[PDB]
Amino acid sequence: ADYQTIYTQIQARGPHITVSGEWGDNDRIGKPFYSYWLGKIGDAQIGPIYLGASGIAAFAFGATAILIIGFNMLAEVHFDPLQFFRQFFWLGLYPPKAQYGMGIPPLHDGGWWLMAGLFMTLSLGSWWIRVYSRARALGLGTHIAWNFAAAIFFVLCIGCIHPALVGSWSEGVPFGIWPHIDWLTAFSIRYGNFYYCPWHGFSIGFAYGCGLLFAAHGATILAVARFGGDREIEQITDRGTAVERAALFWRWTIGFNATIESVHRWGWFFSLMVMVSASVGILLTGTFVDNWYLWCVKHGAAPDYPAYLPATPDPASLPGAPK
């Protein structure tokens, strides 16, 4: 076997490299240090990190959201530290339970939730500027930032755009470990079974597709590490036997193949489309479709099955039934 593909048998150490960017060189902090054990499976060097105004702002806004959520969770256990720790996963900061439409809810029924959502958004925005700016500063394209923009957009869809489109803050995602999970079921139930939403399906096909493609691509490059396949940029600019063999592996297996550059386009696209597809689904839900299962029945697509135990009429529809 190529043991190098499992771990680095002999580690190298040398002087730290710094690449100058257009601005910000004096805003890096930390003194790099090395981990021997990390160096078995990754680069041994940890740090330094760029600071900068946008990352500072991301932390300020993020910390404020975290404090708002945190202090509300604490209120939920009446400020008992031991019960906080115990009950943590079950604790949450919730959107309005009552229907006030798009009216700013009172603090005791959604208002803190809305405030947390605002600071979280400001935090993501600020981080996005960091992700985009660092690329420009180092003379790189902004591919990562466009992919990150789509993930942010999706969070905005389930957090506030869909709420705004149906006209109710009560529909937003709660903050909390189990509470954000419980939202998934309430949402799927209210909108008629998210398995019947095509965009849920497309998002999944892309997410599973990312699984498939990162397994395949990661395994492919490991299988050609012996010919320097991992040196991808110079394989793009000067095709070597590594990527000739990679392409032929696939061509011979599935009948077609990518190039070392374009396989990264496919990965970037699949990843993007997890979030694009989910967002379209969310924007259509409640706005233009109320029950996805019924929408699939209407359009001829839902499977149907025989009764196993007897078919059961709705008792509310029987003669003489109570309400």
Partner 1 sequence: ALLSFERKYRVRGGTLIGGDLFDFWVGPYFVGFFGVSAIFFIFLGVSLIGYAASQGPTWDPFAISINPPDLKYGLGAAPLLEGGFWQAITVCALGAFISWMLREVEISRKLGIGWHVPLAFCVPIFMFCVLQVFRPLLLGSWGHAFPYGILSHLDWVNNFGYQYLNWHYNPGHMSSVSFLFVNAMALGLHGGLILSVANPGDGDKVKTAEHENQYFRDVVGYSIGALSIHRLGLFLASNIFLTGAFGTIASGPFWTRGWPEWWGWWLDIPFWS
Partner 2 sequence: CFEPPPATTTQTGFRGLSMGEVLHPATVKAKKERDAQYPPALPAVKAEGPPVSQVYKNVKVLGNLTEAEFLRTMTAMTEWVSPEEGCTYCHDENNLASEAKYPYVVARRMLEMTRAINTNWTQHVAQTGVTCYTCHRGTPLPPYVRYLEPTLPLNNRETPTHVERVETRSGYVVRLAKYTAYSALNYDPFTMFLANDKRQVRVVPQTALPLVGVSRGKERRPLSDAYATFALMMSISDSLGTNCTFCHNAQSFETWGKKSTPQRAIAWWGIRMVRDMNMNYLAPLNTVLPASRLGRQGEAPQADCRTCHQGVTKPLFGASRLQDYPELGPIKAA
Partner 3 sequence: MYHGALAQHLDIAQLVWYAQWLVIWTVVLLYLRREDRREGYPLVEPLGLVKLAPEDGQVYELPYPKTFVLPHGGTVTVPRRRPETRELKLAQTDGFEGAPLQPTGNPLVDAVGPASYAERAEVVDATVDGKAKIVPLRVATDFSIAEGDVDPRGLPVVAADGVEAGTVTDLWVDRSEHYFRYLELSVAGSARTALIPLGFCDVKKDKIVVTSILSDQFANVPRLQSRDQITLREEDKVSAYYAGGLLYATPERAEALL
Ligand X SMILES: CC(C)=CCC/C(C)=C/C=C/C(C)=C/C=C/C(C)=C/C=C\C=C(C)\C=C\C=C(/C)CC/C=C(\C)CCCC(C)C
User: Given candidates 131, 160, 243, 289, which one binds ligand MQ9 under the rule CB under 6 A?
Assistant: 243
CA 302 to chain centre: 29
Residue closer to partner 1, measured from CB, 112 or 183: 183
Query: What residues from 120 to 139 belong to the interface with partner 3 (CB under 8 A)?
Result: none
Q: How far is the CB of 192 from ligand BPB (least distance, A)?
A: 21
C-alpha span between 246 and 193 (Å, rounded): 41
Residue closer to partner 3, measured from CB, 23 or 266: 266
Q: Which amino acid, residue 26?
A: N
Residues sharing a CB contact under 8 Å with residue 185, sequence separation 6 or more, in sequence order:
none
Query: What residues from 106 to 145 belong to the interface with ligand BCB (CB under 6 A)?
Result: 120, 123-124
> Could you say whether residue 143 binds ligand LDA (CB under 6 A)?
yes
Secondary structure (3-state) at 46: strand
Residue closer to ligand LDA, measured from CB, 99 or 241: 99
Q: Transcribe 223-236 into DSSP letters.
A: HTGGGTTT-HHHHH
- Find out whether the peptide bond into 48 is cis, omega within 30 degrees of 0: yes
Q: Are strands 45-46 and 49-50 parallel, antiparallel or unpaired?
A: unpaired
Query: What residues from 95 to 134 belong to the interface with ligand X (CB under 6 A)?
Result: 104, 114, 117-118, 120-121
CA 75 to chain centre: 29
> Among positive and negative, which fits the CA dihedral 306, 309, 315, 320?
positive
Residue closer to ligand X, measured from CB, 143 or 190: 190
Segment near ligand X (CB under 6 A), from 70-78, 186-194, 232-240, 310-318?
70-78
List contacts with ligand BPB (CB under 6 A).
Answer: 58-59, 62-63, 66-67, 123-124, 127, 131, 144, 147-148, 151, 208, 211-212, 215-216, 219, 253-254, 271, 274-275
